[PDB]
Ligand binder design. Structure first.
Ligand code: NAP
Ligand code: GHU
Length: 165
């Protein structure tokens, strides 16, 4: 793989229904997925919507070892340790960028993405008003589906690694 390409990837964890967010939070806890997320994104640029930035406790922000970028329409938004952009036009300039949520920003970034790393959580959360949702992937995406695994908590999950040209 010759150097010099600008890879844009999407990474998310979803319930079976496609629910990714509820009440300004992720409605489950899966440490194994946090470790997975960290592993994929480490050393790269991460892009997130303002609501996702807000969803992170101040104590953990900006996420370590990564260039944190926050998308907002508020020119005066204060995001300590991160940069704020007002469109994705200049958010995808890095050699490798991972869009890390939330629902709105996934929809905005998907047309530029060539990788998707999805954690599917076997939890039956029906979609509710106000939920953040995963994007729907079309038939252009291909890749490897992982085997089901139990987390330490008993929650069942599996990993999808998708890509396309
Ligand atoms: N399960 C997962 O993998 C995962 C990952 C990340 C987040 N989440 C969850 O998802 C939820 C957040 O997702 P969300 O869809 O509500 O919000 P989001 O995509 O994180 O953020 C939306 C905000 O981004 C800014 N924005 C959106 N479109 C824009 C555009 N075209 N130009 C400029 N700025 C734009 C706006 O910020 P301003 O309002 O400041 O203008 C908007 O309010 C939370 O519940 C979070 O916990 C889940
Ligand atoms: C030790 C706690 O670590 C943190 O606070 C950061 C991890 C974290 C934990 C808890 C809640 C949110 C969170 O981050 C919300 C942004 C990332 O969301 C994603 C994502 N885009 N893709 C995947 N596969 N998983 C997650 C969540 C780990």
């Amino acid at each position: 793989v010759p150097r010099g390409s600008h890879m844009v990837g999407l990474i998310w964890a979803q319930a079976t229904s496609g629910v990714i967010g509820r009440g300004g939070d992720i409605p489950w806890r899966l440490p194994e997925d946090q470790a997975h997320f960290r592993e994929i994104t480490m050393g790269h640029t991460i892009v997130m919507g303002r609501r996702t930035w807000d969803s992170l406790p101040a104590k953990v922000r900006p996420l370590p070892g990564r260039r944190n970028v926050v998308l907002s329409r508020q020119a005066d938004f204060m995001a300590s340790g991160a940069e704020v952009v007002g469109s994705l036009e200049e958010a995808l300039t890095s050699p490798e960028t991972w869009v890390i949520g939330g629902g709105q920003v996934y929809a905005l970034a998907l047309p530029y993405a060539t990788r998707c790393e999805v954690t599917e959580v076997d939890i039956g959360l029906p979609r509710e008003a106000g939920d953040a949702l995963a994007p729907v992937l079309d038939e252009t995406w291909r890749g490897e589906t992982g085997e089901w695994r139990f987390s330490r908590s008993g929650l069942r999950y599996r990993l999808y690694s998708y890509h396309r040209s």
